[PDB]
Amino acid sequence: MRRLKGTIRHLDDQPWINVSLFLTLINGTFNSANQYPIDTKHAKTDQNGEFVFNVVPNVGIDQSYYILTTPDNKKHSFTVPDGTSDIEFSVVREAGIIATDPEYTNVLNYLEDYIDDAIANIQAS
Amino acid sequence: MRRLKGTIRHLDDQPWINVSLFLTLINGTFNSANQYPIDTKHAKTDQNGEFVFNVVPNVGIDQSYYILTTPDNKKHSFTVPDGTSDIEFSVVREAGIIATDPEYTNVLNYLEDYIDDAIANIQAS
Amino acid sequence: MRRLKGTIRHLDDQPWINVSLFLTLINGTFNSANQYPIDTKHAKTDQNGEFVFNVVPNVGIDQSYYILTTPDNKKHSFTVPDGTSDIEFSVVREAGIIATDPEYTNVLNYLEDYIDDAIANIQAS
Amino acid sequence: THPLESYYNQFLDGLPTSELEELEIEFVAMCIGFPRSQNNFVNALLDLSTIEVYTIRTSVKEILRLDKLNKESIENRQVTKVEDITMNMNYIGDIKDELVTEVKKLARILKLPVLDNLYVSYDDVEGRIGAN
Amino acid sequence: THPLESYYNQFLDGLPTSELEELEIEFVAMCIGFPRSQNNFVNALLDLSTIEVYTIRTSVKEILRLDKLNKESIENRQVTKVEDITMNMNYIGDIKDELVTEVKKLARILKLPVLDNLYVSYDDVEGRIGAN
Amino acid sequence: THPLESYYNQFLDGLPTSELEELEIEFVAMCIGFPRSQNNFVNALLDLSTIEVYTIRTSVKEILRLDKLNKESIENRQVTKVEDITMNMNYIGDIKDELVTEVKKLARILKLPVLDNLYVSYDDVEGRIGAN
Amino acid sequence: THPLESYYNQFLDGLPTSELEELEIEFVAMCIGFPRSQNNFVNALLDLSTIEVYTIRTSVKEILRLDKLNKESIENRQVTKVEDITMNMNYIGDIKDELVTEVKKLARILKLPVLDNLYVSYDDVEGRIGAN
Amino acid sequence: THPLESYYNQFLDGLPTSELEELEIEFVAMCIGFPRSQNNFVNALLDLSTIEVYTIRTSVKEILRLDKLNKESIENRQVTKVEDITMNMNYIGDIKDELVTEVKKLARILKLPVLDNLYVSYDDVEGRIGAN
């Protein structure tokens, strides 16, 4: 999974405090070992204006296409790339709905397991 | 027969505990020696978010078919491929979802040629 | 006189213990020695889900057609062939129908593979 | 799309009659006001006959249909007799009363007094356990 | 496709006069709120004559027809006098009255008290047995 | 297709005055609620003149026709004065009154008291033996 | 654009049957008038059922729809019977009635009484923790 | 160009739920009558939940809209049924009622007693910090 200690600041350079940020996953996503249904979570800015999140990358054919809603009425779309490391919200928002490619590993891995079982059966036959 | 297994967890990757999950056949099916009309079963996630369905390998005379109802009431369509062993639901959820965006003998041909390439690699023996 | 045997099981091979089903002779018939008007018989499921009916072959002079109604509410209309030997229901229900939908296809995504696996036997030499 | 809506829509030839689904049982509990775990409620759920459950499912489908019809009509009532088609201004009352009758029908099939629920209003024959 | 309707529609030339099937008996029991196991109910089920059974089946068929017609017509009442066609506003009341008339007719056929059931209300004579 | 309906359909030119067929006797008992065993009922059949029998059969045919028309007409009453034809909203009441008149004529031909029957309830004479 | 409005827009097929989103809990507590904690609210959210939550979400969806419809309607009511389309002068009253019925439904499904809230007007079943 | 209008028009896809700047508190104070310095008012300003703030802002926007619309409407009422359009002579009353409804809604959200202010009249609850 990936984290995001994105920070939000008041216009006068002071940090927002106890303001609600929202994230929503617009696509039912699923990896080999887990399912991620369309779900939405909310967080509150710390006293210093930071906000943390725990999000998953594109692990299915469809996009792990999140959108974040700011206290200032905005919406912003994006997809968190893969890896295990915290991300800064600035860069991801600068980008958005990066791309998606057919990943059939869940199909491919099962196919490999079944084929290997068949080959072992051939050997034992 | 097949103990279809599945693991569900929130965006925090915390498993959902004892949450309701539904499964339903869509048409009565019968083998040479038995008959399997429509039924719907229910499961609850364990402490680890796991759930098991003793589903039938549904390769029968009539149109065998299954729908899985997730906690978000999203419906996944899939029909169990034959076999006698536990199967991870992600595989069918990605393969049965080939009914979605049903690429006519393109994804299927993608997999066929992948199998051919695996066989070719195996030819070295 | 024949005995119609029929085994009914949930989608997890679990018998539909204590459920109801019906049979009828839609068009009343007769033989040279007996009269068989329209009648409807009801039955329940045993602990195994099996049900046995005492039925008359559809050798009627004018016409003779049975129809069975299941818990699914699907109607299976069939004719019992002549003879006294007990006959399995699945045999006479063999007159079923087929409709087209992509969802019937995923079984091939194994069987074709198995069929492809059969091709492996070719290289056995 | 209501869960029960799709659930039944998958069955076009009448309706299934085997047993009440935990989802259907939950819906019945909700629309009658009986908590699902109430011992008397579960006891009433036992020993049912096939036509009983068929009528229960018919009533549930009617409940859902009339509920949707209630939502859709509110955009009407804006006017009266557009050019000559004058509309019964009590259509809302009619559908509300029909819903109440359906809930009472459920209560009578289960042989149980109807407790306070969303649809009924001040006309109830139950309290906590019994005797209204 | 009500099970009783799917049973009846075969017998186009009249209706059979053999006896009441467990489905027909169950439906009747539901319509007069009599649980089948009641000794008085079954006792009444004996001594049944031919025309009695035939009229009972006819009344049951009428019950089903009117019940379906109710859900058909409830969509109406949305308007009045479309061009010249004024709408009988109590029509649903007429349907209810005829339905309860059929239920009472059945009760008279079986000579049994008509008690609180799913259709009629407040016409509950001498409860389950003598009660109220 | 009522059995007696066909039985009468055979008698195209008028109706016979021979006796009352067991079906006719059963239907009469149904109409006035007199189980055929009752000596007070069977004795009425004894010494029953011919023209009386013809009148009984005519009244029974009328009962059947009016009853069928009752079920037929229910699908009407949806509207009033479709274009220029206003309809008696009491029409159903009219046929109910006709049916009760017919059953009273039946009971009176046999000099017997009309008791609680399927068509009349609580407006009858003498009940079981001396009830009213 | 209401936040919950978008959140529900994300759900094309019905609405999810999962636990209430803390924002949803906030809104329903606003509708009833609890501070998301009264030692009664949380315990109402302790006891959960699948169909319950779907009903809650559809009811609050209707709350939003009706309130925005009310917001829009006020521009009308300037006139009556432009040419022949009259206007229901009670339309806004109808919307108020629907909103109060919806909040009453929320409370009833949550088994809780209604205190003085933004929508309900003097029609309360509660005060502070208990006032009946 | 009211200051709140010129502040809100910057937010389009809804309204922000961040907090209340002194302008919004000043406007709410005027609509409630509490000077912003009142402790019972400032403390109530605390503990606000996001949806509560959203509701306050929506109500304020509606207050502004209705206030402006009142100014336009008065240029009407010079006439009645100009050619075929009847005029709702109490439309101004409707606007006043909606304004007082919104003010009361604000009061309920803040839990404070609605009292002397520009809009509402005689619905003065507690006067100054204690039942009037």
Residue numbers in the entry:
A (entry chain a), B (entry chain c), C (entry chain b): 1 to 125
D (entry chain L), E (entry chain K), F (entry chain J), G (entry chain M), H (entry chain N): 9 to 140
What do the authors of the reporting publication say about this deposited model?
A-1(L) is a Myoviridae cyanophage isolated in 1970s9 that specifically infects the model cyanobacterium Anabaena sp. PCC 7120. Using cryo-electron microscopy (cryo-EM), we solved the structure of A-1(L) tail machine, which consists of three parts: a 205-Å-long neck, a 1045-Å-long contractile tail with a complicated baseplate, and six pairs of tail fibers. The dodecameric gp2 portal, the pentadecameric gp5 and the hexameric gp7 sequentially constitute the neck of A-1(L), to which five neck fibers are attached. The long and contractile tail of A-1(L) contains 24 rings of gp10 hexamers that form the tube, surrounded by the sheath of 24 helically stacked gp9 hexamers.
After multiple rounds of attempt, the structures of gp5 and gp5-gp82N complex were finally solved by imposing C15 and C5 symmetry, respectively. Structural analysis showed that the neck/gp5 consists of 15 subunits of different fold compared to those previously solved counterparts; however, it possesses a same 15-fold symmetry as the recently reported collar sheath protein of Agrobacterium phage Milano that crosslinks the tail sheath to the neck. At the 5-fold vertex of A-1(L) capsid, the 12-fold portal/gp2 dodecamer, the 15-fold neck/gp5 pentadecamer, and the 6-fold neck/gp7 hexamer are sequentially interlocked to form a symmetry-mismatched neck. Moreover, the trimeric N-terminal domain of gp82 (gp82N, residues Met1-Ser125) of each neck fiber attaches to the gp5, whereas the C-terminal domain of gp82 (gp82C, residues Ser126-Leu241) and beyond of the flexible neck fiber could not be modeled due to the poor EM density. In detail, the ring formed by Loopα4-α5 (residues Ile83-Tyr99) of 15 gp5 subunits is hooked by six long α1 helices (residues Met1-Leu25) at the N-terminus of gp7, whereas Loopα1-α2 (residues Leu20-Glu30) of three gp5 subunits tightly interact with the Loopβ5-β6 (residues Thr70-Lys75) of trimeric gp82N. Each neck fiber comprises a trimeric gp82 with the N-terminal domain clearly modeled, followed by the highly flexible components gp80 and gp81. The results showed that gp82 indeed possesses two separate domains gp82N and gp82C, which are attached to gp5 and extended outwards, respectively. A-1(L) possesses five neck fibers with gp82N tightly attached to the pentadecameric neck/gp5, representing a neck and neck fiber of distinct symmetry. Notably, the neck fiber gp82N adopts a fold similar to the previously reported component of bacterial pilus. Notably, the interface between the 12-fold gp2 and the 15-fold gp5 possesses a rather poor density map, indicating that the relative orientations between symmetry-mismatched gp2 and gp5 vary in A-1(L) particles. Moreover, we found that the purified gp82-gp81 and gp81-gp80 complexes could also form a bead-chain-like structure, which suggested that the neck fiber is independently self-assembled in prior of being hooked to the neck via gp82N.
